Amino acid sequence: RLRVLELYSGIGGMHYALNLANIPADIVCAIDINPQANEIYNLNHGKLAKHMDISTLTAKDFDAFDCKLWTMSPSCQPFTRIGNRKDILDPRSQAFLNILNVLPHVNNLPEYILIENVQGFEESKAAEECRKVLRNCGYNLIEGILSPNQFNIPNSRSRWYGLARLNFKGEWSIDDVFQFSEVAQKEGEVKRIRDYLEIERDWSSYMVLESVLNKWGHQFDIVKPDSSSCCCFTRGYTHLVQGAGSILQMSDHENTHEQFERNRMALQLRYFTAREVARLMGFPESLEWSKSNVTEKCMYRLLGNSINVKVVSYLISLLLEPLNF
Ligand SMILES: Nc1ncnc2c1ncn2[C@@H]1O[C@H](CSCC[C@H](N)C(=O)O)[C@@H](O)[C@H]1O
């Protein structure tokens, strides 16, 4: 079976994607500094997540893990750091550079590496350093930008992905991943928002406040159940308006802008629930947090930093093909 090290594990999107890809995978360790993430991780996947600063990992640590696949969703922003006080710096994006500095020292280089990051990572100095050390350590690296709405998922979430195979001299391309998306177009199989919504819940706690709608309401992106996309969810969702996620019109008004000026409260606008956000990001229904100390408000923040499980399941399948499972 494949021993996997899941770095920057969060609530375990990578583990869920490995499950979908039917990889016989043993997550040897999941590492995250956020105890709230680890609490959700361990409740759902088993006690595999450990509290550890990835910037302190040594080659002896990686040797003990002895993992053939490493996954990571590192924290690399800001891509260009400012400031002369390199003395007092907390290890932030130092953790990713620590991985790159320690990798050439391990006893057994991992045969497969999967890296996920935000769009624009590809132009960063960190990406330049990553390509350099991977090339020097004999990896074949392919990379690309992919969004769920390329796979018939009605959500925008463009992300950079790097897939690396050690000592691989064949031919592959990130675009091969589309041979896995069963999706086609018939217009009745095109997924829309309604396919992810919860139904007949009490929406009171999710209704957008009139105070926010009166002050900033023109900045919302409003979608309806029949919409074929919605905007990217972030940590700011339900707190910051612009650029943090779309909201849902529950009323039947066809002309949303016209009704907005007439009476914006009659649009019955609500936030997506955290369950709906999880569904749009490809998490299965088994994902649970009710039995934890983690509130739905905190779940929005954890989900805002999570991968799309569906997209990564396809990339994992592509990455691990030479293992002939
Ligand atoms: N130096 C460091 N050491 C360990 N974990 C870190 C870290 N810096 C950031 N992280 C963690 O890395 C995660 C980046 S978001 C990744 C979440 C995960 N990919 C998922 O799908 O759920 C956050 O949970 C954050 O707590």
Residue numbers in the entry: 6 to 330
Task: Reproduce, without paraphrasing, sentences from the article in which this PDB structure was first reported.
For example, C5-methylation of C38 in the tRNA anticodon-loop by the methyltransferase Dnmt2 was shown to protect tRNAs from cleavage, which in turn has an impact on Dicer-2-dependent siRNA pathways. Recently, the C38 methylation of tRNAAsp in S. pombe was found to depend on the presence of queuosine (Q), a hypermodified nucleoside at position 34 of tRNAAsp, tRNAAsn, tRNATyr, and tRNAHis10. Here we demonstrate that Q34 of tRNAAsp solely is sufficient to increase Dnmt2 catalytic efficiency. We present the crystal structure of S. pombe Dnmt2 and propose a model of the Dnmt2-tRNA complex, based on in silico docking and mass spectrometric analysis of cross-links obtained from the Dnmt2-tRNA complex, showing that Q34 is part of the active site.
For further insights into the activation of Dnmt2 by Q we solved the spDnmt2 crystal structure in complex with S-adenosyl-homocysteine (SAH) at 1.7 Å resolution by molecular replacement. In the spDnmt2 structure we were able to build a loop of 20 amino acids starting with Cys80, which was proved to be important for catalysis in hsDnmt2 and therefore is referred to this loop as the “active site loop”. This loop is presumably unstructured in solution as the electron density for the corresponding amino acids was only observed for one of the four Dnmt2 molecules in the asymmetric unit, and this loop adopted a defined conformation due to formation of crystal contacts with another Dnmt2 molecule in the crystal lattice. Interestingly Pro83 in this loop exhibits a cis-peptide conformation in chains A and B of the crystal structure. However, the structure exposes a strongly negatively charged cavity in close proximity to the sulfur of SAH formed by the catalytic residue Glu121, which is also conserved in hsDnmt2 and ehDnmt2. This cavity might accommodate the base of cytosine C38, which needs to be flipped out in order to be methylated. The resulting model of the tRNA Dnmt2 complex has the tRNA placed with the anticodon stem in a positively charged groove around the active site. The modeled Dnmt2-tRNA complex reveals Q34 positioned close to the active site but simultaneously too distant from the catalytic residues to directly participate in the methyltransfer reaction.
